UniProtKB/TrEMBL annotation:
Family of this protein: Belongs to the class-D beta-lactamase family.
Record PTM N6-acetyllysine, positions in chain: K52
Record GO biological process: antibiotic catabolic process; cell wall organization; response to antibiotic
Reaction catalysed by this enzyme: a beta-lactam + H2O = a substituted beta-amino acid
Species annotation: Klebsiella pneumoniae
Active site, per annotation: S49 (acyl-ester intermediate)
EC number(s) stated in the UniProt entry for this protein: 3.5.2.6
UniProt name for this protein: Beta-lactamase
A cellular component annotation (GO) from this entry: plasma membrane
Length: 244
């Protein structure tokens, strides 16, 4: 581990949007990491919907989710996010960060197996204190941007302690963007229930000959700025010549 190079010039991308945050990048081929803020890079927050990555893996490996086509019917309760008020499969539940679908996963996984799996994953502080169906939103689990990278690297290489199939399905469900230059597999998150409210974007960029892992979070006082998670990350990615 060569350490983490700090590149403060990326702060310009946050300041441009009156925002504060961190982007962490990991060059897989060179085993080199870069961040604008070495301190915040290692600060552990609630994972919020980025927890849908480990939650999906566990649900799949325990057969709570059979495959990416299985339909989880809307419970008929109207919630404030319109896309949640419909039937979902794993693909669309990830895409739209459909919390109630994953809360039901968590309840079926159960506290004991959830704890053991997060320890097996070496995920964050491995603490699931709180409600079994909400701890990643308002309980004890905390993970930093650099810890997200470590976890994502295991998933990329199929090294997590679940089946290869489970890891392949989750990486399929993380698909976010692709073109002839790059593929982004990622997961957003918006931690709102405990201060400070922060937005997440974690994942990686696949190139022909390299993979660049990333994890960012940023202060997010309102949902108004949620698009800045991807916008700021892409500005860093383009400055670093990762995407055109
Ligand atoms: C061809 C078969 O062997 C193959 C299949 O699905 O048909 C099995 C082999 C491993 S088993 C789970 C990981 N092993 C852990 N010790 C695997 C998987 O990890 O998805 N599937
Ligand atoms: C509030 C939490 O449930 C939060 C999370 O679990 O991380 C939800 C809300 C937004 S998706 C809809 C956008 N929300 C407000 N505009 C979000 C995400 O950005 O991933 N997941
Ligand atoms: Cl894919």
């Amino acid at each position: 581990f060569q350490g983490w190079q700090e590149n403060k010039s990326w702060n310009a991308h946050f300041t441009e949007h009156k925002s504060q945050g961190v982007v962490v990048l990991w060059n897989e081929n060179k085993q080199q990491g870069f961040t604008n803020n070495l301190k915040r890079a290692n600060q552990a927050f609630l994972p919020a919907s980025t927890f849908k990555i480990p939650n999906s893996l566990i649900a799949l490996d325990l057969g709570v989710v059979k495959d990416e086509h299985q339909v989880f019917k809307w419970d008929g309760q109207t919630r404030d996010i319109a896309t949640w008020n419909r039937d979902h499969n794993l693909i669309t539940a990830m895409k739209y960060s459909v919390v109630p679908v994953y809360q039901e996963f968590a309840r079926q996984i159960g506290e004991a197996r959830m704890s053991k799996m997060l320890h097996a994953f070496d995920y964050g502080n491995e603490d699931i204190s709180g409600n079994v169906d909400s701890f990643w939103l308002d309980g004890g689990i905390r993970i930093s941007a650099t810890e997200q990278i470590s976890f994502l690297r295991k998933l990329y290489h199929n090294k997590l302690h679940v089946s290869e199939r489970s890891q392949r399905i989750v990486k399929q469900a993380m698909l976010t963007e692709a073109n002839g230059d790059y593929i982004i597999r990622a997961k957003t998150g918006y931690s709102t229930r405990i201060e400070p409210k922060i937005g997440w974007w974690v994942g990686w960029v696949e190139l022909d000959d390299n993979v660049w892992f990333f994890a960012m979070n940023m202060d997010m006082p309102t949902s108004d700025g949620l698009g800045l998670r991807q916008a700021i990350t892409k500005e860093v990615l383009k400055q670093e010549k990762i995407i055109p």
